[PDB]
Amino acid sequence: PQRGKDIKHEISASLEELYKGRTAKLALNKQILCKECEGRGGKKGAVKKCTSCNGQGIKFVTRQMGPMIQRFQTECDVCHGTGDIIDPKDRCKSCNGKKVENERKILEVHVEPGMKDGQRIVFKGEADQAPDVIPGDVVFIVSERPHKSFKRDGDDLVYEAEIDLLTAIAGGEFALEHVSGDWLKVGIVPGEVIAPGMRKVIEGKGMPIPKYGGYGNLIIKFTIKDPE
């Protein structure tokens, strides 16, 4: 009977962060029900329904001119915005009759290793609340921050390496910096890399896998240059 709107909040993370997983303490600022009210608006069993407005501070007047119009009239006698309550001092003080107040709570969202971009982590019922509404959810969406060396593809890592024509034709070492602080030396044999479209594939060197474990591959691409 009236669901409250969700609060969507995306959380960025570097590829290296989604590599080892991360935990973030988040501060949630939201509208909550009056504590010294319990949402009532007044003292237990005090507030009284608006007789002049069987619900909200709303009344309908029908004036004429050319045609007849139904002009919605607000302030219902002893109400409006609050079609009820009344009684000078049976009302909060901590909510002055507005039935709601601010609350700052902390949530710890755990970004598990291998979490894909756009991934959702749902916090049931933590959204804003108002008297009558079923509070919605606080939805975090993992956003993959841009990277200066890798591109992600599912559970792999794509890396464009710039190699010399000489290395490519004679073969030799070659190294890159994995999302995990570890440095990685790669060896290639003569000619292996020069073909158009060539891709080198290195076993479990590319990102943690959500359901299960292990890792995807590290797919390498080559850009070959030769001076002068």
Partner: peptide
């Protein structure tokens, strides 16, 4: 409702 990271 709105949020921010602590620390």
């Amino acid at each position: 409702g709105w949020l921010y990271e602590i620390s």
